[model samples]
Target: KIEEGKLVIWINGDKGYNGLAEVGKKFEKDTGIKVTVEHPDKLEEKFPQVAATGDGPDIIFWAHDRFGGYAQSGLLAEITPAAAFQDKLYPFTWDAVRYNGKLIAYPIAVEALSLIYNKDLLPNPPKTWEEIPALDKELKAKGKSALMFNLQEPYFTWPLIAADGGYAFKYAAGKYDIKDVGVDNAGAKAGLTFLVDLIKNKHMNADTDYSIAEAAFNKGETAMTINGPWAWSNIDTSAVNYGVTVLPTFKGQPSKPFVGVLSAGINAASPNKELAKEFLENYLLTDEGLEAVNKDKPLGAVALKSYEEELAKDPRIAATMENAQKGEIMPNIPQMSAFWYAVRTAVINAASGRQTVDAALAAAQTNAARAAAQLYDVMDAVPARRWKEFVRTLGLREAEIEAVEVEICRFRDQQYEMLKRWRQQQPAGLGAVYAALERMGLEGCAEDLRSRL
Candidate 1:
């Protein structure tokens, strides 16, 4: 609706602002379309409403998590970049922007979790998770945290869970299967036990949050931590020389972290599709454009393949690269929104002594089952057009979606049966074990887990 001489966009944070400000001049000079990028606070919450009423920018920059919501509300334009073009980005980055089978945005940068360690305290990052416990014992005796991360937080929790057999959902064939939530499995329980040991043994505490983790590490009070590049903003790097590496393996299995893509999305309602397309193709898609916006990042895990190819040559970023190679891209399905609360509470309850292990795992299954059931209904009620996208966005075929819709019911039924058997037909050995732990004043934890497993 605006004049032919202009194109407008909205971006987030300092990096986006500096990148756009540097490149807008060349974009305008090349296309005679004066590019204006606005940094709006709370743009994610406001964009859908603003776009619906017809007053939003032509493009918006943000993470892929909110892409599905924007696409669902008909606020984001369905982007169809060429296959060759998408092949240049990390597969995880490209896949994340999809909603109901439609690719809804463009990926510009990527972020993943990696092990950040204090080089002075530790000559090298631990090669395995098992090593952490031994070193943690050594550190505890010295009034230092061996490895500090937010254990109560689910993002960090998933890596350890992945090291075991736990997964939020199974990735089968080419996508995340909605019905295969594996967070409460025996392997997940095994992973959770490690956290319980770390906390109960005083290697780390549940009380630490993101800021606290950073502070503890910065002061050299902690020898290692799991964090990403963005978290470096407040780290007093001078106090502690640090190095990055792939998360250590546990029992010979790798830890898989969640990867997030930062991308630009066009507004579906924009009157400037042709101009928007031209702008991105000529100004955003080229090397000069990508670099102008990305020059500030020396070791940032940006999404471009060409960038990563060059980045991997740097010894420091190589660990991050290897970590990304081993990481899992978080599923963008709405069902995931339900999984968070259910699993988080389960982690806290079992690990914090609020509930017994069996009881916490059992309740988590029930809570997740109920949440999935209700979410299924909420999704099913939408128009078939919208429903189809939801199914496809998760990378499921029609048959898979149907099979999984009924999968939750079976999941809940099985959960009930397991609990019933454990309660009524509790094995004498298991009963004896619980009684022994209680008598030892270890009501909820600090028992021998390896022998139990």
Candidate 2:
């Protein structure tokens, strides 16, 4: 541990870390150790490098997704979760931090999208996916539409795929087998067709982005929409009586959305290990500390069941928990870096009529394979720092990695530029994440971000 005044916390000062300012100050007073919260430049790429050199900060505040790459990189500590942590949190959240049975981080919040409907617009949430059109007829009688969401974005759209029994991969033996990709399978196609039919039937519009869709819901132009807890702030409570529920199903199967967890990782290389652990368990993970993060800001579904249960009266919290159980914890592996582009490309192409349905799914599947190869190579080379394991995980030959480097570099640089602008908007806060269309270089990407976010 560092001497009294030198413990540093590296957070994404660009986005959502301000919630911790109050908590950090409280911890320093409760314990004698002074904590310095640092927003290091290039927090994503920089952390791997710093941690590699063994001079990383005490903690890194970011999503659980990086846990896979970071743990393999040896940048994060395999923390012995506090006595209450294992039992108190949800299962997928715990899974979010795990890589090879190593618990990599402490999860604090979980986010997933579900049905948010105007209670006045319809009596009950749509129980089945096909019943939405009937609900729209009711909204039409009220001079409005029934539901809307970011059609261009796959993060919100992928639930339909799951509802039809589709998945990114079939999981077994504690890891996702990339060989078992299910994007183009029959069940996935059923889901894809359902969305395509929605667009074609004019019930939903492909061109409408999140802003257009969110404004319609807030202004009461639409009766229901699929969104996460963060969108809770956008609803004009004075004007609308809204309740949250899980998505309608396909053939009685629940739609499984991705749950992204916001977590804190202890730096494997930091000197303040003991002190950091003390604060995390004794002070930060307590009920009061948890409140600091969740209280008035656009609240998140937290990891602790007791804390979530306390807020159960809030329908949004209740619905998220219900959906959380049904949904899978998002893959934090480097392989996932590929899926974002691949799946979204598949969705947009099908939605926009840019390609035939079957053709689009095939193309997306191929893209997934390509991106996985490159991302795994990048992470494998940098994090693992072992460039020569070909028989196992290192599937890409050196010439193959060389062949794709230019393409990966080009796409990533453009992505960073776009993301940097977006992060600058986040601190004005989550109530407003308004970014216009992303102008990334070429045709392999969408005109806007249909995937992330």
Candidate 3:
């Protein structure tokens, strides 16, 4: 069960690997377990292939968002953290590690975007975007930017979008309602309008990107920039005297950033499951082990509740935690891939003068639904001739209904071919078919199918 007295772990970065390697040395001395810590390139692409053959590492450390797919594919072992350990970590960190109400991993660290301002410039961070224009007016005369960030990156802009009630998907019943995309809603448009105004007023540069914004802030040419703790190392090396705080409000509503959780999970096929669990629950979850792992690159926000007092000693870490606690966790569903592609395109289009906010977001909503629908396996349910009647009930136009029909026909052909070739078995239930329709924002079609199912 111990696999020749060895435990293998695949981690992401050199810093994490080095720290885990150091802790492994001590673990070996105490328990006589030889721990092999590896930092593998393309671990995501390699993990599924290796795990399928029962040849993967005993453990893997990665972002929690990826675990949803791993858990659904039966690649990960279910884990119940030690009660004491669970109680010591921030409760919000657990959201990312859970799938369908089951625990799938142990949370390791937390991170989220916040407003990083030049202390020497502002003295105090602006409490609202309305306050920013006055500062921008002053900075413009001094050859400086008042506020700047990656206009094309949705991750950096989500807080601005969400401040006025935007969201990628609705969360309910322990799962995401992928059908309910709110990117084009009234409130979301308001948020986008705010950004457009910033650019129109010369406070922000149109068509700017991450590297540009980062470089500008580090050079002290920007009064404030939105960024996460991952930028700490580079920013610390710069001459700018920076301070971190939660994003300023929009129309009295606080901006909500997206929170990312880094976590560790065990491979279901590992022969050393118990040993891996022991190593994780006993060694890695401890204070000493946490310190070792974070020795080189400090975590943005420590998950351990006990570390709160010590972590607060650094004001930036405290601000990060404060914002993270108020933010929503990045959804850990496979459909999230669609969200990124669609929203990024919308952000780029809207931020530039290429498209109106409504047009860009509306197109994003439709395109995201189409992309997400394609992720489902071909379902057995036949596409009936009356599919037009079903989609029309959802108030789709003649052209849109025809497009839906074409997609359904394509799926039907794929299902038939799969059955004939024996590449995959067609399932009895129409659940997958219904889910695909729902994910495509065709709730009426899904509901009609549900009635038949």
Candidate 4:
């Protein structure tokens, strides 16, 4: 009932063709099993719709977060202990593949985020966010920006909030407690305030993109940036030497990055589930498999126990591994999708100076709460009324809600007045205003009038 020597796989092409080619050759040679690997330019964009039709790959290599969505949608196979190959992998790696107590994948690599800086520029990276501005001033005196980041991207800002001791969600009793969403947490507010200050103080460009930021650092025009290992091989360090360091801490607590793991999963429809498990067991969990992954990335290993030993043997990658340990794995919770979009919107608004730090975070919290509240059925049935009790237990006072509602109403009014003024000045502006309203879900426009007027 099992294939003797054949397995098929699908993976994201983001890692590039050569990397996959190399791994494929090795996998085949080791097991005497002919392996077929396919890479798609936009794996995520294609996988979901394809998988929905039951035409997905036999084995998929994807990030833990993306796989979580598939598991929730019932598009993934239910991988059990028998499929786990004796549990030789680290528990944390396993945790990434587990959703609602069901295993769905076997992890392959861990991708951790941290601050990568020019060792030649700073000698030592700052240990706190407060010191960054002063460091920028010193760099500016020499005609360079001290740091650069992509403010338009929330992925870049979320870590800053975490560095300041904030989190986007809290887990309790096997479910996420939206009322505990930390967008408005003190540390998150402070972190956003720091971003605004950085822009106002001219420490970083408010409009920098990934390419621009990478170019600036590589060209020695900036001192540092926040990024992950994926950028390591392409940093263009020909002009200057650089070093990777842990992100700065706040209040003596280390910055915690959003950790993610890339995993190998079996498809229930596959004819070679047994062989696939064997391949994962002998090649991925073994010492040789871990070594190959570490060498291939040279950032870190998926196994926590083996990480330090690997790092020690290769001093060049030591700092990278050290910074990785400070990170917390990003959650695979289903509600995380709504949470990401809402937080991104709020962070972008704050970065663009369209809203105050408190206002933006409050809006984020509200949007997140609404999204979580909509999941009433899912969480209500999750053993113990966890979601309902979590919301009712938040202890939000009536006065606080009233104050927030009043401010929201005032903000809406201001937007309406701006729209009216623009329409009077330029009739063409009316279409744009209406489009904006439509984008904001004002289909009938009655809600807009009622809220504003």
Highest TM-score model number: 3
Q: How close is candidate 2 to the true structure, as a TM-score?
A: 0.78
Q: Rank the candidates by lDDT, best first.
A: 3, 2, 1, 4
lDDT of 4 by residue, 1-453 (tens): 223346766776554344444555688886677776678754654565566566666678878877766776666777665534535555666767776677888776666666878888888889887888888887788888778867766777777777676786785443456567777888888877887778877777668888888777788888888887777776744567877777787667677767788887776656667777767666655666555544543425454445446554643345544555675567776556557767877877877788888998888887875543323332222233232222222222344444444565554333333333332333221123233333444444423432321
Residue-pair clash count for candidate 2: 1
Q: Report model 3's TM-score to 2 decimal places.
A: 0.81
lDDT of 2 by residue, 110-172 (tens): 888889998887777888889877667656776799889987778888888877777876676
Residues 1-453 of candidate 3 have per-residue lDDT tens digits of: 325357888988644678888888788989888898888875754675567566688888888888887777777898877777788888989888888888888888888888999998888889897799888888789888788898877888888888878888888766888898878887788998888888887778777889999999999988999999878778999998999988898878888889888888988888777777888767777778878877856766777776665776788888888888878888888677678778888888887777889898898888775542332322312245534333343233555444444565574553333332221232112133444455566667555544531
For every candidate in turn, the CA RMSD to the true structure comes to 13.7, 9.1, 10.0, 12.7
TM-score, every prediction? 0.76, 0.78, 0.81, 0.72
Off by over 4 Å in 1: 1-5, 170-179, 236-238, 296-299, 313-316, 369-453
* C-alpha lDDT values of all predictions: 0.68, 0.69, 0.75, 0.64
Residue 203 in model 2: shift from native, Å? Answer: 1.7
Shift of residue 57 alpha carbon in model 2, Å: 2.0
Report how far residue 175 has shifted in candidate 2, in Å.
Answer: 2.1
